[PDB]
Amino acid sequence: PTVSQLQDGLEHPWSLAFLPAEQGLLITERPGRLRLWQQDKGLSPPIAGVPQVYAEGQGGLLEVLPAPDFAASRRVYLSFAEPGEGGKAGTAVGYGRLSDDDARLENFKVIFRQQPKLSVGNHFGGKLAFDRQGYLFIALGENNQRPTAQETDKLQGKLVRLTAEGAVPPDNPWVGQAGKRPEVWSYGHRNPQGLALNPWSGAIWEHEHGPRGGDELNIPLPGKNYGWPLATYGINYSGQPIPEAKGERVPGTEQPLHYWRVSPGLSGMAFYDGQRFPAWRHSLFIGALAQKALIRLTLEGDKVVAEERLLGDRGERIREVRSGPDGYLYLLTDERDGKLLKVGAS
């Protein structure tokens, strides 16, 4: 593949999002800054009005996602780790309006908070995605408290579906059910760092880290249990089993679409529906942090039929993957001197 380094000097960049036409790209730096990159103008100073964050461990400023109607509204959603009571943090999601001159995020306000707050630095999740109807999906980790992913009254280890304003859609699976959070779409997730709308089927797909082994790709269905920590393809970091695990397959829990017994460290995900590189059409691209590579899965409908590895000689932790309107892939690398990369098939 071809690789062009478009920008360096990004401190642990986490998310990118394209703005319309040639207006550029927004990029988050996990320590807590939002930037705008454009091909002629380079990288902006930090944009004003961004929330303060819990910038410890894996937390900080996470996803940036312009609203589907950004051209009209200039609305920009952000996810981030937010401090709370008792010195524990949790994920939060809000939005503001990017000013006409790109200098300031105006009137930022939180619309959703993970509760309770249980993290001391790990497993925020944080990816965001809109579906075809404009509903907002939010992927949440279990804050490193493994059993809470199974608990229906806790927002740990859940995929959440909200309206554009953060309200609960009345057809969410748990609405009206005692002891269950009505924001929840699916449960039993560990630490999801991939979330994307399949452009052909209209289904949200998700991926998540396993512990020592067992990273997973899922197609999450409403009200379904993805099994963490009762079911897993991984073990604990010590080499002992995860204490709560009953098996790789556990009845009443849904299997992953695809799994990796040796964890690449999945991060970022994009379906390729461009015209520039026809050989890449109907592929799903996923970053690998630990294995420092880009994964390409060939799809036949909902089936994964082949797995390819790219960029394995570059030595960069791939944190973010987006399919650009110009037909190239755009990546961020997770390092102190983090990079924005433009990647093509040849």
Which are the catalytic amino acids? 123
Cβ–Cβ < 8 Å for 274, 323: yes
Q: How far is the CB of 146 from Ca ion (least distance, A)?
A: 12
Q: State which of residues 227, 265, 287, 338 lies at the interface with Ca ion (CB under 5 A).
A: 227
Q: How far apart are CA 310 and CA 295, in angstroms?
A: 6
At 71 the three-state DSSP class reads helix
In this complex, which beta carbon is closest to Ca ion, that of residue 41 or of residue 261?
261
Q: How far is the CB of 243 from Ca ion (least distance, A)?
A: 16
Q: Does 234 bind Ca ion (CB under 5 A)?
A: no
Q: Does 226 bind Ca ion (CB under 5 A)?
A: yes
Which of the ranges 64-72, 142-150, 226-234, 323-331 carries the binding residues for Ca ion, by CB under 5 A? 226-234
Which of the ranges 27-35, 197-205, 222-230, 319-327 carries the binding residues for Ca ion, by CB under 5 A? 222-230
Q: Does 214 bind Ca ion (CB under 5 A)?
A: no
Q: How far apart are CA 65 and CA 79, in angstroms?
A: 9
| Angle, vertex CA 314, rays to CA 313 and CA 319, nearest 5 | 125
Q: Are strands 125-130 and 303-310 parallel, antiparallel or unpaired?
A: unpaired
In this complex, which beta carbon is closest to Ca ion, that of residue 33 or of residue 154?
154
Binding mask 294-323 for Ca ion (x = CB under 5 A): ------------------------------
Phi-psi region of 119 (alpha: psi -120 to 50; beta: other; left: phi over 0): beta
**Neighbour-count burial for 298-322, b at 16+ CB within 10 Å, e otherwise:** bbeeeeeeeeeebbeeeebbbbbbb
Q: How far is the CB of 226 from Ca ion (least distance, A)?
A: 4
Beta bridge partners of 296: 285, 308
Q: How far is the CB of 229 from Ca ion (least distance, A)?
A: 9
Q: Considering CB under 5 A, how many residues would be counted as binding Ca ion?
A: 2
Q: Put the strands of the sheet holding 204-209 in their side by side order.
A: 191-197, 204-209, 215-218, 258-260
Binding residues (CB under 5 A) for Ca ion: these are 226-227
